[PDB]
Every structure is written in C-alpha cells, then in structure tokens.
Subunit: 234 residues, 3 copies
Amino acid sequence: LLGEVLSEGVLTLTLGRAPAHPLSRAMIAALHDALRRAMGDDHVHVLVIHGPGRIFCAGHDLKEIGRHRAFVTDLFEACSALMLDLAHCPKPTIALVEGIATAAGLQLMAACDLAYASPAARFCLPGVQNGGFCTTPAVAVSRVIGRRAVTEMALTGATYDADWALAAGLINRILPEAALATHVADLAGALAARNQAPLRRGLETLNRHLELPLEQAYALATPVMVEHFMDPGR
Amino acid sequence: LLGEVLSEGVLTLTLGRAPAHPLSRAMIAALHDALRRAMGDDHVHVLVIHGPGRIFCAGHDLKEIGRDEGRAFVTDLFEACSALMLDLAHCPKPTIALVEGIATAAGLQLMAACDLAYASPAARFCLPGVQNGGFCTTPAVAVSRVIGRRAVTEMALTGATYDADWALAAGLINRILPEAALATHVADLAGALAARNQAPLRRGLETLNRHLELPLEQAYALATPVMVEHFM
Amino acid sequence: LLGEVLSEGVLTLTLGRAPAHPLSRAMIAALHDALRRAMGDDHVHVLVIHGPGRIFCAGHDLKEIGDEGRAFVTDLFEACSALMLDLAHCPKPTIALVEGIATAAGLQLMAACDLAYASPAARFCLPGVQNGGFCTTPAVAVSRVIGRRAVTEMALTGATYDADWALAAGLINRILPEAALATHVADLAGALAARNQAPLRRGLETLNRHLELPLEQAYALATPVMVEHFMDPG
C-alpha cells in the first residue's frame, strides 16, 4: 500500500499501512514499482519518501511463514535490490521523518540522498535486543555516519535523538514540525525547477566516484564537467 | 604484565607497567597472546581494554637502544604491532576501550582499533610523531578509519594534544562520561553486550567490518545471506 | 598574477586578480608552475595558499569562448584537475588561509589542501545548480573532506554555508578570530617547517595512499614506512 501524488516534478511517496508503515514483501514491491516507473518518467524530477506520524517506518513486519528460509531469502534479496536502486537513483531522493526510524526503516531513510527530521525523531537499530543484528540496515547507515557511530548503534541497539543524528550526519537539518512539510516541498520543488540533465548526470557521477580512488574519480568526473558547460540549459 | 579477569563473558585486559603502560615487544606479545586465547574461547564474549590511571598508553617503549643499528629489532617490533592491531580491529567479538587519561601514539592506535571507546573529561588524545623527528604512520592508520580526513591530518602534522570534547566531535570516542560513572557504564554496556544472542552478533560485526571496505553492490551481496542467517 | 614570498621554510602563495581571485587558465597554469617548483626545491617545506579579502576564490573565470568552446573548456578542466590532484598528493604540507567566500572551484582548491583555517566571516558554496549546471569536479575534493550527506546537500541545493557548519562538517580544521588567523597560520606552518622533513613528507604521502586501501593492505604499505622513520637521522 502506497500513495502517489505528482506536483511540479515532485513525486511524493506516502507510505501506507499506518502506524508502523512496515516494509512487508508487498510494500517493498510497491516501493520498487514506484521507483522503476519514476526513473523512467520524464515528468518525475525528484522523489520524496514520507512515512507519516509517530513512526517513520518500523522496518520489516515480523510476519509468519513456517513450512520447510525461502521467504526470508526472497524478502531480504528484494529489500536489498530496492535499497541499491534507491541509493544509485540518478534523480534526488528525500526522506521526510517525523518519528521513529527503526531497522530497515532507518535503512530506507539512509538510502535517500537527503533526510530532514523534526525534533521528536528517534533513530534505532534494535537487532541485538531481538536476538539478531541489523546487518542489511547497517550497510546503508554505514555510508552516512562515522565508523564509531554505526558500531555503537548496531551493538547497543539504543534509540538516538534528532540532535545526535544531525551531529552524526544521519539527517541534513532539524526543523520545527510545523515547518518540516514546507521545507522539504520547497527544497524538492527548487531541485525540480533546475536544468535536469546536468543534475542527474552530476548526482550519478558523485555516487560513482565516492567508491573510486582520487585519480580515477577525476578521470570520470572531468568529462562530465565539460558536458555541464556544453549543456544548452546552462 | 597484563592482568586478565573474566566475568559473565566480559574479559577485562588491564595494562601493566604503570604509569605510562608502554607498548613494548613483551607487551605487544602479551596483548596478542591474550587476544588469541580470547577469540577461541566460547566463555569470552566481549573484550574490554583498560589502561588505568593518568595515562591510557604511551605507545611503544622507548627502549629503541637496539643492536642492523636498531633495524632488525625495529622491523620485528612494528610488524608484530601491525599484526596485533589488525587482528584487534578484525576481531569478531566486541572490543571496548576505557580511557581515563592520555592516549599517545600506538596507545591512541590501540584505542582506535577497538570497536568502541569511552572516555572521561580529563582524557587527552595525541599523535606526537613530529616532535621526536618522526611520523605516526602506523598509528595514523587505525585513527584514519575512525575520524575525518582533516582531523587525522591535523593530529599527525601538528602533533598537538586534544581534549575529550574534540575527540567526541571527530568521532574518536563514542560518549563522554564522568570519572565516577565511567568504569560502571563500560562494565554495564559490556555485560549487556555479553548477554545478547552471541552467534548473530559476531557474524554481524565480522560482516560490518569487511563491507565497509567494499562498494555498495558488493556489500549488499555479502550482507544479504548473513541477514538470512540471523533470522534462522 | 600570483605573489610568492618564502620565509622560514614557509612559501605563502598569495592569489592575485583581486577581489574574486578567478581560477582562469592563466591562474591554474601559474598555480601548477608554483607547485612543480617548491616540490623540487628543498628550501620549501610548507605551502600556504592565500586568497585575501571578502572572497577567497570565486572559482573559474566565467568567460566562454563561443566553434562551441568545447576544445578550450576541455583543456581548462583537464588542467584544473591535473592541478587539484597534484595538490592533494603533494608530499609537502599544504595549508589554506580562508577569510572570505570559497565557492565552486575555489572551494575545491581549499578542500585539496591538507589543512584549512578560517575566520568566522568565511562562507562556503557549490553554486553549480544556480547557473544551470553542477559542481562535479569541485565535489570530488569536497567529498574526500566531508561526509556523504553534507556534500550531497551542498551540490543539490547550491546554498551557502557558514564557518560553524564547515567546522562541524570537517571542511575546515579550526575557526580563529579575524585578527589572529594570519599569525596562527604563520606559527603553525613555521612549526611544521622546523620539523624533520623526510619522515614528514614520507608520512604524508603514505597517509593519502593508505586511505584508498583496505585495512590489511594499508598496514602492508604503512609498516615499512614506519621502520624508515626510526632509521632516519632525527
């Protein structure tokens, strides 16, 4: 269950299944279908992922399949395929967080390019308390915060506030909850209003070079910089 | 020497040779020997490294009075040090550093190689390599994986001493806790970590360490079957 | 124009063409020539890149030679990248002295230095998207200096950020009062110049090399270098 609304190039993905907004197998498929269509639609310029209320996203719902593995293997491989596609998405992805982002719910947020929270927003990786470990969510989280920060979240399973998240680089800015909706809408709207071709090529190049050494990064980046200056929309 | 006490899965390694706790060839061998025994013992779940007093660890015993005008000894010492620190960082079991004072050179490295680190306000951090006419190359390795590029470069080049507040911002330490509550928080946290389900904890930490050294797609290829193993 | 004054092993490179200090084809060639010399002169121990005034560096000179201008722009960016890579890998310590606004390729120049000090007035920006483009090459040096989300927000929004944000993001090492900054940089640079130079240069290039390698390979590289320090006369 997903709500989709397009307004001036901005596509807002409003996560259903209130209040926990769980990443069930059907939710992951719905989120991936919405993304495959968005990346192929010229009308969609920017993506906004909103999990409304008290909980941004609780992660996968602890549902029961017990016959024979095959379900959990399908679940995680599809979840990883979504998170990969979302982080490597050429078009800007923004997460609007008003509450708690836990487990795979923190991953969804961490996989977005930008993340804006209200002061009441809490962040967690609770695996150790449930007799597990958040291996897959720590992949996307480890890319946005320092090695000490992710190690403490994963090992202790504690809930962290918005202030710690701002200082760690988990979110971009903390805004009062009445201003959060407008801030994201204006920021996304302005992003949608710029010359698109250099934006997508620029974001794609940025993601690719962060996994390359300095020398190869400049080899990739330089011709991409020439192309921006040769663009008719400059 | 190296005092080692075990509780409910919490092995606390107390550094000897007070007050500076120098990382001598003997100390390096003792720390590596203690780590080896701890990794193959089911009863040891979490490791707590502690250097009590005003100094956490001075890093490398200045007994470089060696023979190869010191060369063979110096090569042996640094290879054994890198072998210990590499195995400490890549330890499947959680390692915590309890800091009450000054962590210098290889001592700051020892702290950096740990999965977690907790300090008191009086705790100081430094890479003094330039003062003696050298450079903290090996200690800079573990420190560079824990703090930002500009931060490592400043510690290394200036050789200055930094306080606890700077170390928290740079991500060198996890949290600052008062002297009266430090030794209890680390013990409580270590106990909490030792009481959790052990198999998915070690398999998850082992995976976090190696996926951090991989590109996104490859990290997701290694992590997904491990995440399946957790739930089973 | 580029002014250079050597004193106590510290070569302060003062950017000319005030107030903007544009990184024109001439300025890039002058900065590269000033870098090649010094790198080959034992008398130069520490480098200081200065850009006096309200502006540190505006970035590239916005003059487009319009058949196309492609075979000029390609030569500009290639040479810009050749300088920034050379500057980042330079074994001799490089320090930026920022007191004003460092924007576009000007922020790149700053980010490529080993250390950077600023006054509380100093501003930082990547305005690419405002002019219908994207700061792709400047983002390369900046992304090796600040975290994932901080660089993503700078490039996508194009907004300007203050010194406090730069300190927190790690873009600059320390904020100093306006009437103390120049002397703090001169006292620090002088202290590095008086240090035993061989292990300093050897240790700096090794640090930059191992940060692009996994842990095991990082130690295989670093360990013999540490043995070389202890065998050096000093």
